[PDB]
DNA sequence: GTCGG
DNA sequence: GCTGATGCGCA
DNA sequence: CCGACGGCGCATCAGC
C-alpha cells in the first residue's frame, strides 16, 4: 500500500541476491529492510527519512533516492535485461528448485518451465511434483477451505487412534483469512524424548490420509516429519480445488506445546517473547523451557502441559493466538 | 547489506 | 555399501 | 573493523 514501489524494489533484489548471487545474509538484509518499510504510517520522501528505520542502511538509502527521483532502479533494469539472471530467478519458482540447481539448468539451456517439461529425466522426484503442481503451489489458500482441510486431517487423525494430539498451527491459527500452506504439528502419549514406545506413528497417519485419498503426492518422509501435497475432494459438478502442499510434522508429547506456540507464531511475538524470558530468566526455544542459573546456564526442561504453562513461568498474562500479531 | 561487539 | 556434505524448504 | 546473521529433517550427491 503505502511505499509499495519500495518494497516490491527491495523484494526484488532480495530475491535476486538469494538466487543468483547465492547470498543469504543479502536476502535477508534486503526482506529486513522490505518488511520494516511496509510498516512504516508514512509515505517515505527520501533515503535519509528511511534510514532511520532498523535495517534501513546507506546502501538502501541511496537506492531509495534513486527511485523515489526516477521511479526506478538501473541495477534492477540491468538485472531484469540479463537473460540468465532472470531465468535462473525465475526456475527457483518451482518447488526442490533452488539456486544451485536453477544456475546448472540454465547453464545447459533450461530456462523455461517447457524446457523442463522436456528435460523431466534431469529433474529428481521433488522438482517433478514442483513442476507438476507449479501454478497450485503459487495459490494462497483461503481460510474456509483450511478449515475444510483441518476437519479431514483431525478426523482422520482421529480414525487412527483416540490418543493423537493434531494441531494446525501457523497463521491460520492466529485467524488468518488466507494461508499459504498447512502445517500440522502431530503427538501421542507413546512418544516422549525419553523412548518410542510405538514404531510408525507418523507413517500411520499419513497412510490413512492416502486411503482417503486427502494427500496425493509425497516430497519427503521420514520418522518425525512428512512434507507433501494434498487436495480437498470436489462435486462432479464443480471444479476441482487446487493441489495444496501439506507438512505433517512428530512431535515428542513432553515438547508438544513448545512446538505448538513456536510453530504458531509470529516471528515477531516469538521474537519478543524469547526476549522477556530471558529476563525472568528462562530460556525457550522450539523445544524446551529452561531456567537460567546465576551464571547464564540453562538447567533441565520444565514440565510443559499447555501453552499457557509457558506463559505462567515468565509471568506474562496469556494471550490467544489472534493476539500474537 | 546492516548491525552490534 | 558406508559416511559426511550439500541442497532444499522450512518458524 | 570484523564476523554474525535460524538451524534442522530428509533426499541426494561426493568421495571413498
Ligand atoms: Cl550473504
Ligand atoms: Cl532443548
Ligand atoms: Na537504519
Ligand atoms: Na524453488
Ligand atoms: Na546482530
Ligand atoms: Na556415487
Same mark, same amino acid.
Given at each position: ?29 534486503? @526482506? ?41 532502479? @538501473?541495477?534492477?533494469?540491468?538485472? @531484469? ?245
Amino acid at each position: 500500500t503505502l511505499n509499495g514501489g519500495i518494497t516490491d524494489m527491495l523484494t526484488e533484489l532480495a530475491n535476486f541476491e538469494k538466487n543468483v548471487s547465492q547470498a543469504i545474509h543479502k536476502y535477508n538484509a534486503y @526482506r529486513k529492510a522490505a518488511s520494516v518499510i511496509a510498516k512504516y504510517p508514512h509515505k517515505i520522501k527520501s533515503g535519509a527519512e528511511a534510514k532511520k528505520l532498523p535495517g534501513v542502511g546507506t546502501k538502501i538509502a541511496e537506492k531509495i533516492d534513486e527511485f523515489l527521483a526516477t521511479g526506478k532502479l @538501473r541495477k534492477l533494469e540491468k538485472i @531484469r535485461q540479463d537473460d540468465t539472471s532472470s531465468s535462473i530467478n525465475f526456475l527457483t519458482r518451482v518447488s526442490g528448485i533452488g539456486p544451485s540447481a536453477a544456475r546448472k539448468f540454465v547453464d545447459e539451456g533450461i530456462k523455461t518451465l517447457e524446457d523442463l517439461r522436456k528435460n523431466e529425466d534431469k529433474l529428481n522426484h521433488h522438482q517433478r511434483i514442483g513442476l507438476k503442481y507449479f501454478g497450485d503451489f503459487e495459490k494462497r489458500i483461503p481460510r474456509e477451505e483450511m478449515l475444510q482441510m483441518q476437519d479431514i486431517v483431525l478426523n482422520e487423525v482421529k480414525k487412527v487412534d483416540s490418543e493423537y494430539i493434531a494441531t494446525v498451527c501457523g497463521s491460520f491459527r492466529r485467524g488468518a483469512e488466507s494461508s499459504g500452506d498447512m502445517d500440522v504439528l502431530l503427538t501421542h502419549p507413546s512418544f516422549t524424548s525419553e523412548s518410542t514406545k510405538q514404531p510408525k506413528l507418523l507413517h500411520q497417519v499419513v497412510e490413512q490420509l492416502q486411503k482417503v485419498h486427502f494427500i496425493t503426492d509425497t516430497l519427503s518422509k521420514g520418522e518425525t516429519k512428512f512434507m507433501g501435497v494434498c487436495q480437498l475432494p470436489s462435486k462432479n459438478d464443480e471444479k476441482e480445488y487446487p493441489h495444496r502442499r501439506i507438512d505433517i510434522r512428530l512431535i515428542p508429547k513432553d515438547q508438544y506445546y513448545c512446538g505448538v506456540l513456536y510453530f504458531t507464531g509470529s516471528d515477531i511475538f516469538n521474537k519478543n517473547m524469547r526476549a522477556h524470558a530471558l529476563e525472568k530468566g528462562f530460556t525457550i526455544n522450539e523445544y524446551t523451557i529452561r531456567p537460567l542459573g546465576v551464571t547464564g546456564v540453562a538447567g533441565e526442561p520444565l514440565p510443559v502441559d499447555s501453552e499457557k504453562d509457558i506463559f505462567d513461568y515468565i509471568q506474562w498474562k496469556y494471550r490467544e493466538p489472534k493476539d500474537r500479531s
